[PDB]
Design a protein around this ligand. Structure first.
Ligand code: NA
Length: 129
C-alpha cells in the first residue's frame, strides 16, 4: 500500500515511533519518503546480493530472512516478506531494534543524506496527530 504523508505519520505515532530513541516523528516520515516513497511493497537489490524491503528498506543481510542472502542474519526473526505488508507493525518493530543498535537512524542512508540536519518537522505539518 502507498501511504499518505499524514496517514503514515499517524500510523507511526500509534506504534510508538514518535521521539523513539530521541528521533521525532518527522525523522521517520522523512526517512520513509526517501527510502520507499511511502510504498510498503518497495524492494531494492543491493550489490552484495542482499535486498532492502518495505517502507523503511530494511536490509536482509542482518535483519530479515529472504532465503537468498547467504551468510546473513535474521536479527528481527521475521521473513522479509512480512515487511511488505500494508500493516507497518513488523517494519516498525524491526526499525526499533535497528535504531537501537548504536548508530541511531544513520543506518538509513536516505535519512543521513536527505533528512539529517533538515526541518524534519515540516514532514508532519498540517497532520492531525
Ligand atoms: Na537475513
Amino acid at each position: 500500500k502507498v501511504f499518505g504523508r499524514c496517514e503514515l505519520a499517524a500510523a507511526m505515532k500509534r506504534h510508538g515511533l514518535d521521539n523513539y530513541r530521541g528521533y521525532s516523528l518527522g525523522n521517520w516520515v522523512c526517512a520513509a519518503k526517501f527510502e520507499s516513497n511511502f510504498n510498503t511493497q518497495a524492494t531494492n537489490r543491493n550489490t552484495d546480493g542482499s535486498t532492502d524491503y518495505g517502507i523503511l528498506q530494511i536490509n536482509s543481510r542482518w535483519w530479515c530472512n529472504d532465503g537468498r542472502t547467504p551468510g546473513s542474519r535474521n536479527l528481527c526473526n521475521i521473513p522479509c516478506s512480512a515487511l511488505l505488508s500494508s500493516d507497518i507493525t513488523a517494519s516498525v518493530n524491526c526499525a526499533k531494534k535497528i535504531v537501537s543498535d548504536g548508530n541511531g537512524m544513520n543506518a538509513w542512508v536516505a535519512w543521513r543524506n536527505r533528512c539529517k540536519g533538515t526541518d524534519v518537522q515540516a514532514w508532519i505539518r498540517g497532520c492531525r496527530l
